[PDB]
Amino acid sequence: SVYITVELAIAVLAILGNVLVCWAVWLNSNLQNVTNYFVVSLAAADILVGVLAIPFAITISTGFCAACHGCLFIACFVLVLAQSSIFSLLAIAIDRYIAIAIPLRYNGLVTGTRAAGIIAICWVLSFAIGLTPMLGWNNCGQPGCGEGQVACLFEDVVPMNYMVYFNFFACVLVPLLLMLGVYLRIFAAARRQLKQMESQPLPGERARSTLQKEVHAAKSAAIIAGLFALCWLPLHIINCFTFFCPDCSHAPLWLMYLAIVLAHTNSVVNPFIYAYRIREFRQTFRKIIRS
Template structure:
C-alpha cells in the first residue's frame, strides 16, 4: 500500500475521453460541441481505447469501437432484409394484375420508401454515426434524408387508412372515387410533400452556427484552420426543436392519431353493418374481408408507431430535460435507431402472414426467379384471388 502512495502519478490528459495533448483552448471548444476531439491522424493509438464514458450511475458500458462494430453489423443485416423484402412486394404487385389495386399502389409507395431506407438511409446513418469531418450542408443532407423517407411512409399509411375507410363507408361509390390513376397522382403529391417537410432544415432551421463555432477563436473571431469544419453527427446539424416541435408534434404524431381514429371508425362502421341487417352470404363475406384487411393495416400502423416512438421519446427528453439527456449512453440511441430502421423489414412479413394471395405471389416469384423452378400451377393467382385482392389485404 505504501509503495502505491509513493509512486509518481502521470498527469491526466486533457481530452474529453482522456486522450491527446494539453491544449485547453481546443478541448474547451470541442467540449462545447458535446463530443470528443478525435482525429485519427493525430491520435492513431486511440481507436482501441475509447469507451462510452457518458456520465451515469452505471459507468462505462462497452468500448465505443465494439458498440460501433455491432451497430454497423446489425444495420447492414436490416438493410439487406429491408431491400429484399420490399423489392419482393413491388415485384409481386407488378407481376400480378390482381394485386394492382389502388390500396396496393399505396403499399408499393410504402415499400419503395422502405427500399430507400435499406439502400440509402441506413448507409447514411452508419456514416453519420461515425462523426467524420465534413462540410455542414453535406452532413445536413445525410441527416435529413431519412426524415424524407419517414414522412413518405407516414403519408402512405395515412392514404391507405383513408382508402380503407372509403371502402367501408361508401362501398357503392368506392370504385368510382378511388381509381388507379388518382392513387398514383396522390402518391406523387405525397412524395413531394415528404421531401418538402424532410428538407425543411435547409431553409434555415438548423444548427449551422452552433456546429461551426468550434472552429472560431476564443473571442476574436479568428478561424482555426486545423479544426474539423463539422463533426458529422445528427444532433450537431439538426436542432432538437425541429425534431420535436415540427417533425414529431407537427408531422408524425397528428397523422398517427388520425389513423387511429380512422381505424376505430372502420371497425365501428363494419360492426354496425353486420349487426343492423341480415346480410346475404356474399355481402357478409365481403364485409368480413374488409374487416380482415383493416386489421392487417392497423397492425402495420401499430408496428410503425412502436418502432418509431422510442426515437422521438429520446428526442423529447433531449430537448426538455437536457441534464438527463447528457446521461444517456450511446448504445441507447443506437438501439432506438435500429428499431426504427427494423420497421422497414416488418411489412412484407405482415403481408405474407396475413394475406394468402401476397403469400402465393411471393412464393411464385421466389420459385421462378430465385430457385429457378418452373411454375407448375400456372395462371396469375389462385381461384378467387381477384375478389380477395381488390380489398388490398
C-alpha cells in the same frame, strides 16, 4: 463492428423484402388494385432505407466532414423516408375506411389515377418537410474539419426544436392520431354493418364475406401502422426527454442506437406482415422464389 454488422443485415432484408413486394405486385395482376399503389410507395420508401438511409446512418454515427448542404442531406434523408411512410400509412387508412364506409362511391372516388397523384404530392411534401432543416433551420457552425467543412453530427447539425415540435408532434404524432382516429370509425362502423346484416330477412353471405374481407384488409393495415408508431415512438420519446428535460440524463449511446436500429427495423416487417396476413401475397411470393 457489431452495430455495423446488424445494420448491414437489416439493409439486406429491407431491400430483398420490399423489392420482392414490388415484384409480386408487378407479376400478379390480382394485387394491382388502387389500394396497393400506396403499398408500393411504402415499399420504395422502405427500400431506400436499406439503400441510403441505413448507409447514411452508419456513416453519420461515426461523424465526418462536409459542407452544410451535404451534411444535412445525409442527416435528414431519413426524415424523408419516414415522412413518406406517414402519408402512405395515412392514405391506406383512409382508403380502407372509404371502402367500408361507402362501398359504392369507393370506386368512383378512389381511382388508380388519383392514387398516383396523391403519392407524388406526398413525396413532394415529404422532401419539403424532411429537408426543412436545409431551408435554414439548422445548427451549422453553432457555438477539426477546416473552414467550409462542418463536423457532421446529427445532434449538432440538426436543431432539437425542429425534431420535437415541427417534426414529431406535427408531422408524426398528429398523423398517428388521425390514423388511429380513422380506424376508430372503421371498426365501429364495420361492426354496425354486420348488425344491420344480422337483422336482414335474407342470407346474403356475399355481402358478409366481402365485408369480412374488407375488414381483414383494414385490420392488416392497422397492424402495419401500429408497428410504425411502435418502432418510432421510443426514438422520439428519447428526444422528448432530452429536450423538454435538459436535466434528465441524456440518453446513452448504447440505448440511442437501439432506438435507431428499431426504426430501421420497421421497413423489414412489412414484407413479412404481407406474407402472413394476406393469403394472396404469400402464394405470390412462394411462386417467385421457386421459379
